[PDB]
Structures are given as structure tokens and as C-alpha cells.
Amino acid sequence: GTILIDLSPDDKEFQSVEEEMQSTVREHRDGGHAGGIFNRYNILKIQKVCNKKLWERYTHRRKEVSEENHNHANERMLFHGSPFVNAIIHKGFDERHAYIGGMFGAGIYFAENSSKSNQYVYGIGGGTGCPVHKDRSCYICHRQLLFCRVTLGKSFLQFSAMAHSPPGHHSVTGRPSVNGLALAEYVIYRGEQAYPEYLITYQIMRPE
């Protein structure tokens, strides 16, 4: 029951989502190995993901968390890149979409840096790159990211360089403690704590 609604580039909503995408690009410690080499994106399309049952599943869980955390859901808008994005927008997030080998355990990971999520579009470590050219830095092929509404509740803070949340917490926050320019990454352990709100289609752009 998912429908996708295209946003106009003239729409303030398109513009605010594009700005969050573009402004959160950073350099990565792999020199571009996983995600490719780029400083900005060519945004091709931004679509709103509308699914009433998935939305109600999200808001139900959001209310439970909020009531466990002094009426504070601690909701964020975060990026998610995955080879499962077409399944996620139709079926919702669930344990099949978790990263079993993640550093905070088997969970569903999200990023503040759009370029961090871009590293995972073609799989863990960028897999083998795009299916057409086998190129992790492909400038031709269209990529997709999700910009998701995420309930963190009481988040366990890890200072750093499906499983359960730590007891007494609803998520984990990975705070960068070496790279002064990296933004945070977050993990949830219940698929109901995220809603895939926007589907963003783009290309990475070759630096000039």
C-alpha cells in the first residue's frame, strides 16, 4: 500500500531535503573506496513515501517510547542507504534489513552525514559498486537514499573511533571520538522506530 509522490523542485519541502543531503557531505577515511569520490550530488528526484499502515506502526511505537521517556520521543531525520531500499519503502524496516556485523551489534543504522549512507547504497563496503559498471564511484548510475523519521528515545552514548537495545535505552548513538568532522550515527533495534519518509534519487558528481 505504498504510493510515491514526486515533489516539485519549487516546493520548500524539496528544497529543505536537498539542502540536508548536500550540506552533510564529508570526506571519508577510505578516500572514496566504498562510496566514490565527490563533493556534491546531482539530485534527480525527491519522492514522499506514503503508507498509512507503516505510518501507524511508526506512530504507535513512537508513543510507547515517548511514554517511557518523559513524553520525549527524541525524533530525528536521518539518512539510510541500503540495497534493500525498494523493499523497505514497501514493507517497512525489519530485522531482514539489519547490519548483522555492525559495530553496535545487529541493528538498523542511520547517519547524519548523507555521504556515510551513500557508502552503503551498493552494499556493505560499497559491495561491487553499481550493477551496470561494477564501479563504486560510478557517476552515471542513479542511486537512491532514504531520509527517514527515526525515534531514538533514551539513547545509549558510545564514544567511538536483531540485537536488543542496552537495558533502559531505545537506541544507541555512535559519537565520533577521532574524526573531528564526522557527524553521529545511530542504531535502532526495532524496525517500528523508523519511517522511510523521503526517497531521494541522485548521482554523485565528479569533482571538477
Ligand X SMILES: CN1c2ncccc2C(=O)N[C@H]1c1ccc(Cl)cc1Cl
If binding is defined by CB under 6 A, does position 114 make contact with ligand X?
Answer: no
Cα–Cα distances (Å) from 196 to 22, 141, 142, 180, in that order, read 19, 22, 19, 29
In the range 131-160, which residues lie near Zn ion by CB under 5 A? 132-133, 138, 140-141
If binding is defined by CB under 6 A, does position 98 make contact with ligand X?
Answer: yes
Which residue from 43, 48, 77, 99 is in contact with ligand X, where contact means CB under 6 A?
99
Q: Which is nearer to ligand X, 54 or 108 (CB)?
A: 108
Q: Which is nearer to Zn ion, 58 or 120 (CB)?
A: 120
Cα atoms in the Cβ-side hemisphere of radius 13 Å centred on 177: 8
Q: In this structure, what is the dihedral angle of CA atoms 24, 21, 98, 141, given to the nearest 10 degrees?
A: -120
Residue with cell 552514548: 157
Shortest separation between residue 145's beta carbon and ligand X, angstroms: 8
If binding is defined by CB under 5 A, does position 98 make contact with Zn ion?
Answer: no
Q: What per-residue string of b and e applies to 86-95 under the rule 16 or more CB within 10 Å gives b?
A: eebbebbbee
From the list Zn ion, ligand X, none, which binds 105 (C-beta under 5 to 8 Å, kind-based)? none
Residue with cell 523493499: 87
Interacting residue ranges for ligand X, rule: CB under 6 A:
79-84, 97-99, 102, 108-111, 116-117, 120, 124, 185
